[PDB]
Amino acid sequence: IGNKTCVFEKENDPSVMRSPSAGKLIQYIVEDGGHVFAGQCYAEIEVMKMVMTLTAVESGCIHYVKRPGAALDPGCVLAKMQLDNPSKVQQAELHTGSLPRIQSTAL
């Protein structure tokens, strides 16, 4: 803004596994409650009549939200993973106020 800089964080912190696309869930690869490592496939979904797996981002204990056989939407909640919470805990405190409103340009 002008000659000043402000940096906003894009939320990716809750460590919730999400479907990248629409489609259908066929099955899960690992046990509910089992530990998964980053890069390991944890789920099998099909969109396009063409099967695409799903790799975990973080290493932790996975618990599944959707049961095997389910409709998937992009960005939906598929499976949560428990991690050791290095940081970024409770970075919400959702602002509930009102933005500045002095002018109006209504003539």
Partner: protein, 107 residues
């Protein structure tokens, strides 16, 4: 998707799931209290929604029992039910029979 939509699935759950049965029977008691009825209704909603995917798999299994070769054999749309491992022998002797029958029938 045509004959066993959600409404009928819920009707099925009404007579199967012990938890949903217990809650449904408890809510049937006249004049318990306002608060208790509200709690029971929310419990019923959560339980019936939670049980949809499993009873959906049950439903398609039920429908699958209608598509078996036993039914086709009773209705007379197939000739017989065969085993794979011995199909070679069966079809050999059958085709031999049919060819000889064709010869005599042409005569």
């Amino acid at each position: 998707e045509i004959k066993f939509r959600r409404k009928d699935l819920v009707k099925t759950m009404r007579r199967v799931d012990p938890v949903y049965i217990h809650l449904a029977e408890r809510l049937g008691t006249p004049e318990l209290s306002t608060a208790e009825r509200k709690e029971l209704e929310n419990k019923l909603k959560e339980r019936e929604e939670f049980l949809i995917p499993i009873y959906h798999q049950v439903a398609v299994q039920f429908a699958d029992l209608h598509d078996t070769p036993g039914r086709m054999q009773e209705k007379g749309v197939i000739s017989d039910i065969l085993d794979w491992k011995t199909s070679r022998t069966f079809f050999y002797w059958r085709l031999r029979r049919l060819l000889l029958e064709d010869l005599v029938k042409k005569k």
